[PDB]
Amino acid sequence: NIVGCRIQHGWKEGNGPVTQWKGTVLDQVPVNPSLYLIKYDGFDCVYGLELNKDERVSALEVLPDRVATLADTMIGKAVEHMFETEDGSKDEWRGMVLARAPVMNTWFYITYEKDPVLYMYQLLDDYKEGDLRIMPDSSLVGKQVEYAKSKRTGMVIHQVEAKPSVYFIKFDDDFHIYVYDLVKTSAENLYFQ
């Protein structure tokens, strides 16, 4: 519907100030069509919002385009992804390339051990720049999930084709997309229905 569109909207939490956001709608989630995945300009995580019911969203507008519209071997690979720090020095995070992003062609879904939520980057550009090291190599979708150890509910929204024990989860209480490999320790408190 609004998938593939660029959007703008206000955001307000509680009595806080309204901030303005511009982004690109990537996906309307099949198991919950209220849920949209959005890439905001300049922000590297993928966000999920239930736009038709989230009272924090105001003044939702579709923007006009005004401009008219293979490294798939990276998919599934463990990588080391370098980036810049305040001090001028580079650091790196290690992670896994999950998939090509929808809608924004040249972009890839990736997640990281240090922050296992969904990110989206132009990985082939970063590779050409020397900032992406590829390491040598080497349904539950729609179910409810709960985390208790802390009692958090959500839904399994995607399975990663390249690594089928890996799933994307949307928790009811947050707008990040959480990524889990269900055989690992990070997933050991997740239970499904």
Tokens 């399994």 appear where?
156
- Judged by CB under 6 A, the chain residues 101 through 130 that form the site for ligand H7Q are 112, 121, 126
Q: Would you say 128 or 184 has its CB closer to ligand H7Q?
A: 128
- Side by side, which strands form the sheet with 19-28? 46-50, 35-40, 19-28, 6-11, 57-63
Least Cα distance to 117 among 148, 87, 88, 157 occurs for 157
Tell me, by CB under 6 A, how many residues bind ligand H7Q: 7
Structure tokens at 58: 């105001």
Binding mask 133-172 for ligand H7Q (x = CB under 6 A): ----------------------------------------
Q: Which of 11, 40, 93, 171 binds ligand H7Q (CB under 6 A)?
A: 93
Taking the least distance from each CB to ligand H7Q, the nearer of 143 and 176 is 176
The CA distance from 156 to 169, in Å, is 5
User: Interface residues with ligand H7Q (CB under 6 A)?
Assistant: 44, 81, 83, 93, 112, 121, 126
